[PDB]
Amino acid sequence: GKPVRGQRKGAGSIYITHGHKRQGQARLRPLDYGERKGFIRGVVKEIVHDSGRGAPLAKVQFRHPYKFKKVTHLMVACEGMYVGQYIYCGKKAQLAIGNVLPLSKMPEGTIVCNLEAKVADRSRLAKASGAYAIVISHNPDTGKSRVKLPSGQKKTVSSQCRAMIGLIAGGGRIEKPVLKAGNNYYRFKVKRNCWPRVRGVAMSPVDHPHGGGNHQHIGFPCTVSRNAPPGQKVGLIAARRTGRLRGGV
Template sequence: MAPGQHRVERIEYDPGRSAHIALLSIKEGNKINYSYIVASDGLRAGQQIESFRSGIPERLIKELGDTSDAGLLATKTCHPGNCLPLHMVPPGTAVFNVGKAKHGPAKFCRSAGTYATVIGKNEGDAKWADFVDVKLKSGEVLHIQKDCCCTIGIASNVDYNHRQLGKAGRSRWLGIRPTVRGVAMNASDHPHGGGRGKSKGNRNPVSPWGILTKGGYKTRKKSKVNRYVVKARPRSESKKAKKAKKLKKNK
């Protein structure tokens, strides 16, 4: 979204994404320019939203009495649909369309109903002073540059995960093909195939090409750890580990 005040013309459906999109208009001289953004939940036609990508405008500083108090600034800027750099967002605010680079596009929380939470500014830490801590929907906490932009609110169409496709044909339109269990195939078609009954021959779960599928095949080297990850997202546990944890809890 270009810097400045925009008017929401209408909310539209986008067949290429799960969230809705908003058509914006901005007057520049004698010309009206149009652009699209991912709509925030609750955004309606006729509303005014603003982008602060290029910083705080002079009219807003004068309106606040030539002060740059963070609390007063947040009351004027942190409204759903507004685009702000992360360092202008107060901790605890829900944001989406979070960028990864200063002038780059949004990378995190772009699908329907998703959001991230700004949880810290690292002002007391010299090493990470230029970064803001953001907690993603998965539970992962990341260091993201403070000049990266985000949109205030939650991505629209929050009930998307409750939709019912209704028939197998609609799944095929979405590119979802039928899934067949490996144990139901012939031995020549899958490593789990063949034999009598539903047995996979006491073998660890593998893909049709023989690669371990349940946490056994690691793809990231230990030397290539992402240093921007403060807290990794919770990983799925095996049935055995879940059962052991449940028994320990009941004791």
């Protein structure tokens, strides 16, 4: 009868992010002449806590490309980065923690974060707490590069994508068990309206394909198709397998 929770969320009325008191986008300084040809220096002016995020951010101040000015960019912090650090951004930057340099000046063992997925893009990969990617290999024939992502996947991105050298700060936070419901309450109160989460077997058949019945159960296989309409796409979406994972994944 009635639509589903994950179908009313995408409508985005009271499921908008609680971002009012956040810091903005955390991205690498954009690509300009300095960052392409040589290197540019920036002072890590502050490390700050961003709401709804696990990693600390860093206000890093560079000079303006063509104006008498100081552009204060904001990027996810590298673990070990301190205030007043002098990070370096560009092609001729050195292989030091916090530096931002193209994915081609990096040897084939480098541990990187804030990784770009496209050229002139600004840091769309490996951005959560304790996240890091590992530069696997380079290909000069294409100017591209295989990198190992935190997910364990291996993505090929151009060797003009810029990363940041090191880990993302604030690591180890899933290694603490949330002990109370109130901890997760405060956790999600600054992210978005998604907690607590009623389970579909506890609803009525008007509200969810799982609701109703005299015993709380799903009467049909949970593994739903990928071509399933929005509204019966609840359960395990296009699951290749189910059950306990043992041996290889």
